[PDB]
Amino acid sequence: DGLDDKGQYQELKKRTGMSVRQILQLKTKKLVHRRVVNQTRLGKIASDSVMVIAGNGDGWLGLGMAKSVEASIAVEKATLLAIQNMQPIPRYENRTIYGEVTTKVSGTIVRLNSRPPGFGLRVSHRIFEMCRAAGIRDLSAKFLRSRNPMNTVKATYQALLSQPNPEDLAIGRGKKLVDVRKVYYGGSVY
Amino acid sequence: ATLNQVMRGCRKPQRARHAVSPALSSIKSPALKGVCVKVGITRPKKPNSGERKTARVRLSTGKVITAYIPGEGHNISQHSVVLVRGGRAQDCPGVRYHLVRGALDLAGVATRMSSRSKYGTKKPKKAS
Amino acid sequence: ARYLANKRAAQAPERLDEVFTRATIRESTAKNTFVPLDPEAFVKAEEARIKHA
Amino acid sequence: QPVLSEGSREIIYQDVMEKGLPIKAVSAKYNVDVRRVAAVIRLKEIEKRWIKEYKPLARPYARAVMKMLPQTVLGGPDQKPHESINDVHVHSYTTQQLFVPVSESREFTREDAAKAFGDHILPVDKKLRVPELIEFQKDLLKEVPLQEANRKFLNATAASEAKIAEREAKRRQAVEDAITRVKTDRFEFRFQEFNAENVGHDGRDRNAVGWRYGVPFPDRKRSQIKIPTKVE
Amino acid sequence: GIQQITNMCSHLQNASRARLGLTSLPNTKYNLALALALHRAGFISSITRGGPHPPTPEALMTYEPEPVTSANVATRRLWVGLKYWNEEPVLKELKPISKPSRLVTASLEQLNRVARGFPAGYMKGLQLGECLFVNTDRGVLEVREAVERKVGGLVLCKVK
Amino acid sequence: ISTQAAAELFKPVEGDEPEDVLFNSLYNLRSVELNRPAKYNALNGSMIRKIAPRLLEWERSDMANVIVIKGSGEKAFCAGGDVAALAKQNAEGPEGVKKSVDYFGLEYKLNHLISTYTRPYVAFLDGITMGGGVGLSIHAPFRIATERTVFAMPETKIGFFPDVGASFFLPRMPGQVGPYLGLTSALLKGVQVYYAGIATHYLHSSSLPALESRLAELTPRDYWTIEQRLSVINDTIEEFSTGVPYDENIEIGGKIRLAIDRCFKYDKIDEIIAALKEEAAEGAKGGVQSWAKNTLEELTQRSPTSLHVTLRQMRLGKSWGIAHTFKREHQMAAKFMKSHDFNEGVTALLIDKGANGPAKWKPASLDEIPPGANISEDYFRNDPEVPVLELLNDRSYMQYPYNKFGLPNDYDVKEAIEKGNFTREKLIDHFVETRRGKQGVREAVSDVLDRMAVRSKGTEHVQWKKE
Amino acid sequence: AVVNMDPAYMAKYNGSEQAAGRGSGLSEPPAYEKTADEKPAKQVIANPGRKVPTPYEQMTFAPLERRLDIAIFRA
Amino acid sequence: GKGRIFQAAKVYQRASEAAATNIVSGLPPRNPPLWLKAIESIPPAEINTR
RNA sequence: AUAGAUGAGUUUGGUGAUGGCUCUGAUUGAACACU
RNA sequence: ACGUCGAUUUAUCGAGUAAAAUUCUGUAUACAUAUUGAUAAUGACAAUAUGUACAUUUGUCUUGACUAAUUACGUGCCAGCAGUCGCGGCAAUACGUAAGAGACUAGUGUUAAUCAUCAUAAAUAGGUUUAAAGGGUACUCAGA
Ligand SMILES: [K+]
Ligand SMILES: [K+]
Ligand SMILES: [K+]
Ligand SMILES: [K+]
Ligand SMILES: [Mg+2]
Ligand SMILES: [Mg+2]
Ligand SMILES: [Mg+2]
Ligand SMILES: [Mg+2]
Ligand SMILES: [Mg+2]
Ligand SMILES: [Mg+2]
Ligand SMILES: [Mg+2]
Ligand SMILES: [Mg+2]
Ligand SMILES: [Mg+2]
Ligand SMILES: [Mg+2]
Structure with a gap:
């Protein structure tokens, strides 16, 4: 429908297998933007390294990283590279993560906590974009050791994929893991 | 440090950080009055260039410090009672104080229209 | 009242559903903590004396 | 949301006052919150006063505004319920994410969930404003005749209002027993009695009577409310 | 003493980190009480005291150990069967709280708060999957088993 | 029955050892190990009161997906109940007799629960399985035999009869093998239990620990039907099969199998023995003179009352439901x-263990019982003083719901021939590929055709013999 | 915030069915399998309308609704 | 820690979760890979356990 | 009292760390300047 | 007021519902009356209630990034700005004017100080191979 005449989403249209009008309905955001430099025999070569998160808003999130000499070509690479790396992120009652998670990425330790409903997204700016794009509504996060713009995103995205699965923990111990909130109200209250 | 090492008092206070305006930070004062001892010019540091109007002031406490004269043009000279406030000229070493322009003897910029409160200038009083 | 209630809970029977769904631990391992003196200690000391000699 | 019709307000008033039915039964009958049924009666009582005192009602403003809002006429034409009469408050203790490990074959009931959140918490079966509906539904599961279950509901609710009215009666009667009204030439002095020893274990107690000695004036503090907090 | 519980906590971590099917522990009353508690929670598979060599795997629980007298007490050893599910150990972390340098004790008012994800004292709230073990007058119980019995006591370790 | 109703129904009585049974719970597995090797894991009241609550409790959980029952020692799995103790109680007045009557209540109550269990139930027959041990196995959909398995029901030798579920499992058995195993009290060892039909699979005794570790991994979905769950376990049990022996042949097959169908088809013991005498007599076309003569010696050494009573329930057992059977x-x-007879046989062959001579049955021989006499009538008339057994549940069925995981028997080969036109060798391959290569299908199917099939239209067609 | 609970569910069930399975509840097949069979699965036991998100974000300015000057404008 | 992380023993778990929901909310999930139902009831065996 | 735990700018050709400084929040028995 | 002003593409975009104007209210407050602080009696001074009446100012900081908000002109490493990084060397969104915009408001900024930021003296709760930091050694009293 004349939306994508640049040919950028064509290849992505095959991998993901969905209309171009749907690719534009995703929540994309450029979190990090570094200005790296490489010394060569012909002088410095300065590149832009950009990380972009793509999220559906209801439990899907993807992280993409790319770089180029032009800041515009780098954002398009990560955008397409982030929409094809989307993964289903489990979330308790479609509003928060399961329990607490702690991930370390080369000196950057991130700690995510699940909070009750109505708590809100009392997190940093980079964690706010990811949670807001994945569908998370109540969470608390703290950076313990370092606050690298890049490793903080890699750790956060890695923590959402390392949530403790309550059903696997149950079969491992041979005991139920009854969620009290679901029995109290006779059903999940999203 | 083990628990026994903390009983004997191993957690001592961190070393103090020098204040921006020691003459004021010491006695918990927001400002101090002083008599100018010399009104000259200071040269900025490596990157900057120009001439900063500075005044060697002797505070009421007794210490002699180097204040900065903000604004364009001043009317203070030897033996002038001026008020001193905290601050610093980032490109001038030793200049760690400022002078209020609406002070006792120092007069505010007369042709100032922007941020008059910072330079002690009354309203032009045109339509008044 | 607060005392009897607390003392009653600290000496209450285990839940039935938790007694029928727990693997068996042999009593020879979970209750035989006492270590009595070797009944054959005297006979062994006499036999060890001959071997050492 | 819809608003009770001008006539519907009369149906509720004529039911609680004339027929003397309990507010709980009227609430469950028309699916109107007990707090709204009590407010409609208060507002209607004021109308009777105005009409009794020959005061001009704002009929032109009432008719014109009622045509801009959706309405729900009660009685015969009951297309939908007015609102939800079984709304329970989300207690902060019950908002926590708890996965309690229990045996594989346990019958975890709402009672067990309340104790997991806290030892003093009650299940949702006791936080309802009309807890008689549960008992009414338990009779239908046994296939008890319908109108017979309605009879028990009325007696249950009607009996519950008596207990409430009896409690507040003894309370108000005990509050006036502590007041000694001594009439004088000008005023009537009201001497209230109280146990002066109920000042906690260290003198600090919220319900203590007196002006606390060791406090300065907070009038210079930010956000110091100086407005009447309660118009009683 | 409590030093045995710390050595036991770290050993079970190293054993699960190495993906070992069996593991040995010094035979002591203190160690056995914590082992039984872990078993009652489903974290380990078996408990059996034997010699320096593990019993037959096929008949582990059927293995009838010999009486523990003073002639072989020095060689006895507790053998616990570790548990692994879904490419992950069931006993990943066994962070201790009470160390020889300080024995941390908790009250019933604090255990009630910690059992619902809220810090109290020198402890931190429990999250999904985490488990806390307290040594009380009624044996080494779980923090939630000690809340129903209305008792507090020494905090031993925290299992994730 | 609820948890409390079960806890107060199976309360431990005095004399109950605490570790009679050893229960274990793995990821998806729940095992039940009979820990009484000193007495060959002989079932008793103390051991039954511990299994019934667990089974009822595991039935309420969606976590337990595979139940396993096994023995402790390396010789026996469950070597019959404690009938010796019942003999003493029977000689303590009427009240002392009702103690034994209540014991059979616990046993039948448990064996009925196993038959109508709503979860996959496996049984490792790694050792001798007799009496009570047969009640915990035959009703399960999976019965694994091994090199050490020894199946037999020596209850007609003590004056008793096939105790539990034998009146439901043996009658609806291919041919007259049921009545034979019951009356004669035959002894099947090893793979012979797998060929006869008692066992469903056949593994080695050493590959059982590896099978359990695998069964614990299987995690079925909550929406899978009971059929799928059994299919997943069946395929897993067949992965550990190391192959049946190469020289061991089908014991009850060919001539002997045919002789059983020609001498155990009547409803009177007199006719049965009469037929065997013909087979025993030299010159008979059967060619089983050795087996026939040996069988007669075994039938004339058992209580004649049990024979008449046993054979009576084999013909009626084919018309009862599993619930009505117990x-x-x-x-x-x-x-x-x-x-x-019972009080005499037990005291003479178990308590005295061969001392004082052989058991003296009240009727010395069958010929003593005149033809017109019917001693089998009294044992099928419910009396008022004995309340009717109150089973733990209300489930029942006339035919086994899932009993097709064993080798194909005559029933499976027959229908397969009516729905199609398979040939001699083409029909064997049909079962092999349909069975996914189960060990012993080629030999079992071939045996069935050799007995109950002919060369109707030359090589292409194959039909049955009985027209 | 509040939660609506019908007395019909309270009378029949006591909340045990919500813990069946492994604690979270009895799992159901995926969406790409249900309609594949012409027959739908049995209804899940729960209160009516018990999976709708609650809009806590819109209550940011709720305290202002309590003032006397705002309440007059909202009436 | 030089070696790469092999998640081959979880292909079914990972692949099944990716097919439970569709990226485009409000639509039914597309058909899963043809192997998802083939190994549905054949989980891997426990490895790396001495 | 069960909602209460948050970051940002700045060292390098560049990356990742270590580590200070400053900013963002609240406040004063305050002072000064413009009002 | 089918007027005025500001820009500028000379016809577009704003000032602008803003103003004027019209219709109402009577808030602080003023005045008046009554009650009240107190009763055996004593009121220095004021509060409260009711009635009538009145529509009265803007100011300040910011505008390169941190940090919400723009152009034009002048100056030309000069004059000056600056909490941190920094800006100014003849076509400066950073200095000085003008206008616009962002924001607080009878207050607004600045200076000084305290808490938090800072797990930045870490009891809860740190660290010491190569980055601040393992004592030259281990026998050993006290002490853990
Ligand atoms: K740092
Ligand atoms: K500098
Ligand atoms: K065995
Ligand atoms: K050294
Ligand atoms: Mg301006
Ligand atoms: Mg370098
Ligand atoms: Mg007034
Ligand atoms: Mg900006
Ligand atoms: Mg300025
Ligand atoms: Mg720099
Ligand atoms: Mg400027
Ligand atoms: Mg004010
Ligand atoms: Mg030295
Ligand atoms: Mg040195």
Whole structure:
């Protein structure tokens, strides 16, 4: 429908297998933007390294990283590279993560906590974009050791994929893991 | 440090950080009055260039410090009672104080229209 | 009242559903903590004396 | 949301006052919150006063505004319920994410969930404003005749209002027993009695009577409310 | 003493980190009480005291150990069967709280708060999957088993 | 029955050892190990009161997906109940007789629960399995035999009868093998239990620990039907099969199998023995003179009352339901405690273990019983003083719901020939590929055709013999 | 915030079915399998309308609704 | 820690979760890979356990 | 009292760390300047 | 007021519902009356209630990034700005004017100080191979 005449989403249209009008309905955001430099025999070569998160808003999130000499070509690479790396992120009652998670990425330790409903997204700016794009509504996060713009995103995205699965923990111990909130109200209250 | 090492008092206070305006930070004062001892010019540091109007002031406490004269043009000279406030000229070493322009003897910029409160200038009083 | 209630809970029977769904631990391992003196200690000391000699 | 019709307000008033039915039964009958049924009666009582005192009602403003809002006429034409009469408050203790490990074959009931959140918490079966509906539904599961279950509901609710009215009666009667009204030439002095020893274990107690000695004036503090907090 | 519980906590971590099917522990009353508690929670598979060599795997629980007298007490050893599910150990972390340098004790008012994800004292709230073990007058119980019995006591370790 | 109703129903009585049974719970597995090797894991009241609550409890959980029952020692799995103790109680007045009657209540109550269990139930027959041990196995959909397995029901030798579920499992068995195993009290060892049909699979004794570790991994979905769950386990049990022996041949097959169908088809013991005498007599076309003569010696050394009574329930057992079977067996076994044969046989062959001579049955021989006499009638008349057994549930069925995981028997080969036109060798391959290569299908199917099939239209068609 | 609970569910069930399975509840097949069979699965036991998100974000300015000057404008 | 992380023993778990929901909310999930139902009831065996 | 735990700018050709400084929040028995 | 002003593409975009104007209210407050602080009696001074009446100012900081908000002109490493990084060397969104915009408001900024930021003296709760930091050694009293 004349939306994508640049040919950028064509290849992505095959991998993901969905209309171009749907690719534009995703929540994309450029979190990090570094200005790296490489010394060569012909002088410095300065590149832009950009990380972009793509999220559906209801439990899907993807992280993409790319770089180029032009800041515009780098954002398009990560955008397409982030929409094809989307993964289903489990979330308790479609509003928060399961329990607490702690991930370390080369000196950057991130700690995510699940909070009750109505708590809100009392997190940093980079964690706010990811949670807001994945569908998370109540969470608390703290950076313990370092606050690298890049490793903080890699750790956060890695923590959402390392949530403790309550059903696997149950079969491992041979005991139920009854969620009290679901029995109290006779059903999940999203 | 083990628990026994903390009983004997191993957690001592961190070393103090020098204040921006020691003459004021010491006695918990927001400002101090002083008599100018010399009104000259200071040269900025490596990157900057120009001439900063500075005044060697002797505070009421007794210490002699180097204040900065903000604004364009001043009317203070030897033996002038001026008020001193905290601050610093980032490109001038030793200049760690400022002078209020609406002070006792120092007069505010007369042709100032922007941020008059910072330079002690009354309203032009045109339509008044 | 607060005392009897607390003392009653600290000496209450285990839940039935938790007694029928727990693997068996042999009593020879979970209750035989006492270590009595070797009944054959005297006979062994006499036999060890001959071997050492 | 819809608003009770001008006539519907009369149906509720004529039911609680004339027929003397309990507010709980009227609430469950028309699916109107007990707090709204009590407010409609208060507002209607004021109308009777105005009409009794020959005061001009704002009929032109009432008719014109009622045509801009959706309405729900009660009685015969009951297309939908007015609102939800079984709304329970989300207690902060019950908002926590708890996965309690229990045996594989346990019958975890709402009672067990309340104790997991806290030892003093009650299940949702006791936080309802009309807890008689549960008992009414338990009779239908046994296939008890319908109108017979309605009879028990009325007696249950009607009996519950008596207990409430009896409690507040003894309370108000005990509050006036502590007041000694001594009439004088000008005023009537009201001497209230109280146990002066109920000042906690260290003198600090919220319900203590007196002006606390060791406090300065907070009038210079930010956000110091100086407005009447309660118009009683 | 409590030093045995710390050595036991770290050993079970190293054993699960190495993906070992069996593991040995010094035979002591203190160690056995914590082992039984872990078993009652489903974290380990078996408990059996034997010699320096593990019993037959096929008949582990059927293995009838010999009486523990003073002639072989020095060689006895507790053998616990570790548990692994879904490419992950069931006993990943066994962070201790009470160390020889300080024995941390908790009250019933604090255990009630910690059992619902809220810090109290020198402890931190429990999250999904985490488990806390307290040594009380009624044996080494779980923090939630000690809340129903209305008792507090020494905090031993925290299992994730 | 709820948890409390079960806890107060199976309360430990005095004399109950605490570690009679050893229960274990793995990821998806729940095991039940009979820990009494000193007595060959002989079932008793103390051991039954511990299994019933667990089974009822595991039935309420969606976590337990595979139940396993096994023995402790390396020799026996469950070597019959404690019938010796019942003999003493029977000689302590009427009240002392009702103690044994209540024991059979616990046993039948448990064996009925196993038969109508709503979860996959496996049984490792790694060792001798007799009496009570047969009640925990035959009703399961999976019965694994091994090199050490030894199946037999030596209850007609003690004056008793096939106790539990044998009146439901043996009658609806291919051919007259049921009545043979019951009356004669034959002894099947090893793979012979797998060929006869008692066992469903056949593994080695050493590959059982590896099978359990695998069964614990299987995690079925909550929406899978009971059929799928059994299919997943069946395929897993067949992965550990190391192959049946190469030289061991089908014991009850060919001539012997045919002879059983020609001498155990009547409803009277007199006719049965009469037929065997013909086979025993040299010159008979059967060619089983050795087996026939040996069988007669075994039939003339058992209580004649049990024979008449046993054979009576084999013909009626084919018309009862599994639930109605246990109830009748309760009243049936209750009248045996009062009889003289049981009290005599048990005291003579178990308590005295061969001392004082052989058991003296009240009727010395079958010929003594005149033809017109019917001693099998009294044992099938429920009396009022014995309340009817109250089973733990209300489930029942006339035919086994899932009993097709064993080798294909005559019933499977027959229908397969009517729905199609398979040939001699083409029909064998049909079962092999349909069975996914189960060990022993080629030999079992071939045996069935050799007995109950002919060369109707030359090589292409194959039809049955009985027209 | 509040939660609506019908007395019909309270009378029949006591909340045990919500813990069946492994604690979270009895799992159901995926969406790409249900309609594949012409027959739908049995209804899940729960209160009516018990999976709708609650809009806590819109209550940011709720305290202002309590003032006397705002309440007059909202009436 | 030089070696790469092999998640081959979880392909079914990972692949099944990716097919439970569709990226485009409000639509039914597309058909899963043809192997998802083939190994549905054949989980891997426990490895790396001495 | 069960909602209460948050970051940002700045060292390098560049990356990742270590580590200070400053900013963002609240406040004063305050002072000064413009009002 | 089918007027005025500001820009500028000379016809577009704003000032602008803003103003004027019209219709109402009577808030602080003023005045008046009554009650009240107190009763045996004593009121220095004021509060409260009711009635009538009145529509009265803007100011300040910011505008390169941190940090919400723009152009034009002048100056030309000069004059000056600056909490941190920094800006100014003849076509400066950073200095000085003008206008616009962002924001607080009878207050607004600045200076000084305290808490938090800072797990930045870490009891809860740190660290010491190569980055601040393992004592030259281990026998050993006290002490853990
Ligand atoms: K740092
Ligand atoms: K500098
Ligand atoms: K065995
Ligand atoms: K050294
Ligand atoms: Mg301006
Ligand atoms: Mg370098
Ligand atoms: Mg007034
Ligand atoms: Mg900006
Ligand atoms: Mg300025
Ligand atoms: Mg720099
Ligand atoms: Mg400027
Ligand atoms: Mg004010
Ligand atoms: Mg030295
Ligand atoms: Mg040195």
